Structures are given as structure tokens and as C-alpha cells.
């Protein structure tokens, strides 16, 4: 059986892959009440139990997928979890390329880290991250917009 690793990037912000997202017991142990599913094809796990608030960012792992368009919507959901003292899990698939992009963007905007420091911070807690040059380029443009206040 799979040992579910729900990585706490921040005490209320967790990152995982598709198999980590299927462990209901771990999610309730960690006081998680919000889930962001960054895939088009995965089910919203545990949906039928009425335990969590869900948000789907229907993105693919392609070199042309636009994730920047979903940043603000994801940040608003994370902020709602933060304000009510609940944890939020963001997940995609094995290499966590999609979900780690949104986590890093949140750290850049709301923790005021640089892109590099945010990546290193996430990488230290979640060692296995599949690179995506397209998403990396979007984070670099996101950093410049933040540094310019746009």
C-alpha cells in the first residue's frame, strides 16, 4: 500500500501527487478542508463524502499549458483556507510539476520570496519535482511583474 506523503510547505499548505491525495485519514489528521486539483482528468477525490471544499484548475503538463491565468484564483482559495485556520492541499500527478508551480507562485507573492528561494524552499521539502521549462518561464515573468507591482 502507498504511504501518503502530504508535504507541509507551510503549516496550512500541503503539496502532493495523485496517490497522496487519496488518503482520507491523513487529510483529516492534518486538518485539511480545502483541495486544489490541478488536472483535467483526475477525479475530485473524496468528493461524495462532502468533507472538503474543492477547486479544479484544469491544466495539462504540456509545454504550452498556461498556468499563470490560474494564479489569482488559486491564491484566493488559499487565502480563504488561511483565514479560517484550515489546511489546503494542492496536488496533480507524480512529478508535482503543476501543483509545485502554484505553490512556488504563492510563496513569491504572499511570502515575498524570490523565485529561486521559493523553489529551493519547496525542493528542500519535496525533493522529487519534475522540471517544466514552460512553467519555469511563467514563474520568471511572474517574478518580474511582482518586482514592478503589476
Ligand X SMILES: CCCc1scc2c1-c1nc(SCC(=O)C(C)(C)C)ncc1CC2
In the complex, the residues that contact ligand X under the rule CB under 6 A are 97, 100-101, 104, 115-116, 119, 129, 131-132, 135-136, 139
DSSP 149: T
CA 110 to chain centre: 14
* Nearer to ligand X (CB atom), residue 36 or residue 104: 104
Alpha-carbon separation of residue 53 from 17, 26, 34, 47, 85 (angstroms): 18, 16, 5, 9, 14
* Least distance to ligand X, CB of residue 83, Å: 26
* Least distance to ligand X, CB of residue 128, Å: 10
* Least distance to ligand X, CB of residue 60, Å: 13
- Residue 92 catalytic? yes
* Least distance to ligand X, CB of residue 48, Å: 31
Question: Burial code of 5-26, b = ≥16 C-beta within 10 A, e = fewer?
Answer: ebbebbebbbbbbbebbbbeeb
CB atoms inside a 10 Å sphere around CB 110: 14
* Nearer to ligand X (CB atom), residue 15 or residue 81: 15
* Nearer to ligand X (CB atom), residue 4 or residue 136: 136
> Which residue in 88, 92, 104, 139 is the catalytic one?
92
Residues present in the chain in total: 150
DSSP 42: S
Cβ atoms of 68 and 143 closer than 8 Å: no
* Nearer to ligand X (CB atom), residue 85 or residue 131: 131
Q: Cite the active site residues.
A: 92
Amino acid at each position: 500500500s502507498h504511504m501518503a506523503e502530504l508535504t507541509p510547505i507551510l503549516p496550512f499548505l500541503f503539496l502532493g501527487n495523485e496517490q497522496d491525495a487519496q488518503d482520507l485519514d491523513t487529510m483529516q489528521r492534518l486538518n485539511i478542508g480545502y483541495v486544489i486539483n490541478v488536472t483535467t482528468h483526475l477525479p475530485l477525490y473524496h468528493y461524495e463524502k462532502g468533507l472538503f471544499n474543492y477547486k479544479r484548475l484544469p491544466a495539462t503538463d504540456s509545454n504550452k499549458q498556461n498556468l499563470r491565468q490560474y494564479f489569482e484564483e488559486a491564491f484566493e482559495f488559499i487565502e480563504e483556507a488561511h483565514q479560517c485556520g484550515k489546511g489546503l492541499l494542492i496536488h496533480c500527478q507524480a512529478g508535482v510539476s503543476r501543483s509545485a508551480t502554484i505553490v512556488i507562485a504563492y510563496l513569491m507573492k504572499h511570502t515575498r520570496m524570490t523565485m529561486t528561494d521559493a523553489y529551493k524552499f519547496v525542493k528542500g521539502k519535496r525533493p522529487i519535482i519534475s522540471p517544466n521549462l514552460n512553467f519555469m518561464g511563467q514563474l520568471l515573468e511572474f517574478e518580474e511583474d511582482l518586482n514592478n507591482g503589476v
